[PDB]
Design a protein around this ligand. Sequence first.
Ligand SMILES: [K+]
Ligand SMILES: [K+]
Ligand SMILES: [K+]
Ligand SMILES: [K+]
Lengths: 128, 128, 128, 128
Amino acid sequence: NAEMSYELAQHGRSTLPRELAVYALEGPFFFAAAETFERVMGSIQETPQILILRLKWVPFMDITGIQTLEEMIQSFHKRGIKVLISGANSRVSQKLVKAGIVKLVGEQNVYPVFEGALSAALTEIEAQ
Amino acid sequence: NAEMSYELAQHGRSTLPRELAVYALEGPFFFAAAETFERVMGSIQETPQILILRLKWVPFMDITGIQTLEEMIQSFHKRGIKVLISGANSRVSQKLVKAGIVKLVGEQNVYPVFEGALSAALTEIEAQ
Amino acid sequence: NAEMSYELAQHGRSTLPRELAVYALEGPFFFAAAETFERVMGSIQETPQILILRLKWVPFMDITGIQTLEEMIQSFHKRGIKVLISGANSRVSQKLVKAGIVKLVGEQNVYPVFEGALSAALTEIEAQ
Amino acid sequence: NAEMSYELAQHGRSTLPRELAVYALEGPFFFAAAETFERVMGSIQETPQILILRLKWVPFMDITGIQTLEEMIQSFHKRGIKVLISGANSRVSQKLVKAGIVKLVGEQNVYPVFEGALSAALTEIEAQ
Ligand SMILES: [K+]
Ligand SMILES: [K+]
Ligand SMILES: [K+]
Ligand SMILES: [K+]
């Protein structure tokens, strides 16, 4: 991202700090990717403090993608990873509330656009 | 979809109801996706009432994709999911009849375009 | 394909006959697809008589893709499937000879372009 | 590549020699590909002498992709494969140093662009 390079420079960095990871769901049928990423996060030795999950590329979600997204987030939470969500469109944003995803990650950790999630995470890592 | 947002508003909704899921086969070699989706539908706790399977992106199907599509639909039917099919081109449409896929899902559940499958499903969910 | 629809009509068909399947390797790193397709062909009940493997999208092949392609073809041959290859570019065409892939499938079953493989297969199925 | 065809002709070849393989990580979430490629390299009978890993398509890497890339390279090294890296952008280039990836493969095996990695590999294979 140029969104990434701008916020990084605002925080005096060129590279994403070790504490922050970023993953995007690509398209509505992000299931195979969700599964892989969940597997990777489970198998690696060190985990990030914060993971931003970008939803800008998800045009809709049904019960099947909701339950997939839920299980993925549960699997990160159980390793100590704080999960932020960014970029849900207007309809997926309503679905995330109705389905309990917002509950799961916390209202304060849901961002309309990625640059505000990235800004918030870099600020939290600096305080920590 | 804008096709999705229009039919949703016609039914007074902004979001796909919990009872309906939508999956698309991407391209003729949809095998790896078929397998994942079949796995997801088997593993999740709650299943949709209706699943629309979009075939607009499938340009042809051989015996191998026919038997894959058959097994996938069998696997949904056995959990109680009603499967609609939409968007088959003119040749795949003939293949679906000759191969027994139309038999499997029911003639009344096969739609030339997605908006008519979506309209029919939302109407059936409202009656239910 | 329009290449497919033209040759089909030349043979008085609208749909690929049950005896012929077509698979394309997408890109040089076709490994995950090779694996899935090999799995599908092994698990389905009925197999095609002839499988055209399209190589137009493969820009180069190293020892790793050669050994993958070899194992895949071996796995089809052992179920009774005749494998044709089409569309190798000029360099992959030389590699296929040097690596023994042409030996494996037979010189007479390697075609510079897909329409000639499709024409040959439809002709062989009609004689059979 | 035309980058590949030019360097090949400079070395009097039309095809990649049996000793050299080339793999690219596509995008930042190259995990599923990393896993497949690692599996292929482990299962094939013969391995290349040199593997160029192209990073031009990776826009950033977090701890999760670093540990994935590390494990993949470890898995090649343990079969006797020398791994070159090419094409890291300016930020991933800094990350590769800070994370110990450059250590792992050797400074002399990291190239700003693919054509210089390919040139170096073809030269090393010719001396060998
Ligand atoms: K997304
Ligand atoms: K489709
Ligand atoms: K191809
Ligand atoms: K890359």
